[PDB]
Amino acid sequence: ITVKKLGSRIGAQIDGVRLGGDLDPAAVNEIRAALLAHKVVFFRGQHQLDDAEQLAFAGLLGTPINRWHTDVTFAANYPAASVLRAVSLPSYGGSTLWANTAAAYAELPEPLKCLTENLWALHTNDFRTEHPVVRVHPETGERTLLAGDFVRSFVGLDSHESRVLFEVLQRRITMPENTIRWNWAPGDVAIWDNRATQHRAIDDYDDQHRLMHRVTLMGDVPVDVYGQASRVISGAPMEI
């Protein structure tokens, strides 16, 4: 199977694969590895995928369970990844954005690294979690920025400071050079590494009917560059 790089920082297309439960572990590995490298990966023409068969496919990768965000970061062990398929699409608009939060850390100036490495944030939805702003990716070892719309404030700074620094970091993360905007066709499937991305839907299709189907994979508790784990202030962990 084949992997086409869609831009220099994020995104790839994968060809030669019919997604579903029957996949050869060597293929499944190539996909996993493509996902970890490119952060978000696309398959086209998967018209045969239905609800049951998406789930089944998801199951080979891990364990099934508007504004820029990482999914369910108001919880401690937020998802590692999702598989999203187009079901019915609008006649125009409806594209989706992803940003690479590992590339975004790696390109911080040294002073902003020192800042983010030591910075922690309260995320909320009731769910309240203090997470580090820089996590060590458990599979890749890359440090990734952890922020997005669930953030309420930063631990130890005031309102005004929190909001300003939040915007500084979000502007780097969402800089067009670090993002991919996907135009959805029928039979499109997307898979993203939620431990190294943010995403955002675009509401540019007037009130048109749109329906996607998503399967989400269970993820772990972030740890910072010192090994300290996120802290539950409020709410339960996610469970299967």
User: Could you give the residue numbers annotated as active site?
Assistant: 69, 71, 199, 214
Tell me, by CB under 8 A, how many residues bind a copy of itself: 20
Residue 177 CB neighbour total at 10 angstroms: 11
Least distance from C-beta 118 to Fe ion, angstroms?
A: 27
**DSSP H helical ranges for 159-221:** 159-174
31, 41 contact by CB (below 8 A): yes
| Alpha-helical regions (H) of the chain | 25-38, 51-61, 101-106, 110-117, 159-174
User: Which of 8, 26, 91, 109 touches a copy of itself by CB under 8 A?
Assistant: 109
Q: For residues 180 and 93, what is the distance between their CA atoms, to the nearest angstrom?
A: 15
The distance of closest approach from Cβ of residue 7 to a copy of itself in the complex, given in angstroms and rounded to an integer, is: 21
96 marked among binding-site residues = yes
- Binding to Fe ion (CB under 5 A) within 54-93 occurs at 71
Joined tokens for residue 39: 């952060």
Q: Residue 112, interface with a copy of itself (CB under 8 A)?
A: yes
Beta carbon of residue 73, minimum distance to a copy of itself (angstroms, whole number): 19
Q: Which residue, 41 or 119, is less far from a copy of itself as judged by CB?
A: 119
Dist CA 125 CA 142 (whole Å): 27
> Which residue's CB is nearer to a copy of itself, number 127 or number 154?
154
What is the smallest separation between the CB atom of 117 and a copy of itself, expressed in angstroms? 7
User: What span, in angstroms and rounded, lies between the C-alpha atoms of 138 and 59?
Assistant: 19
Q: Which is nearer to a copy of itself, 105 or 154 (CB)?
A: 154
Sequence-ordered list of residues with C-beta below 8 angstroms from that of 73, at least 6 positions apart, any chain: 123, 129, 131, 146, 148, 150, 151
Residue 232 makes contact with a copy of itself by CB under 8 A: no
- Residue (33 or 164) nearer to a copy of itself, CB: 164
> Binding to a copy of itself by residue 164, rule CB under 8 A?
yes
Q: Show the tokens assigned to 109.
A: 């100036």
Annotated binding residue 210: yes
Rounded CA gap, 68 and 147, in Å?
9
Does the annotation flag 69 for ligand binding? yes
User: With the C-alpha atoms ordered 190, 183, 69, 84, is the resulting torsion angle positive or negative?
Assistant: negative
Give just the sign of the alpha carbon dihedral 155, 104, 164, 176: negative
- What does 117 bind: Fe ion, a copy of itself, none (CB cut-off 5 to 8 Å by kind)? a copy of itself
Residue showing tokens 């062990």 = 77
**From the list a copy of itself, Fe ion, none, which binds 71 (C-beta under 5 to 8 Å, kind-based)?**
Fe ion
In angstroms, give the least distance from the CB of 160 to a copy of itself.
Answer: 7
- Give the residue ranges of the annotated binding site for 2-oxoglutarate: 96, 210, 214
Give the footprint of a copy of itself on this chain (CB under 8 A): 109-112, 114-119, 154, 156-157, 160-161, 164-165, 167-168, 171
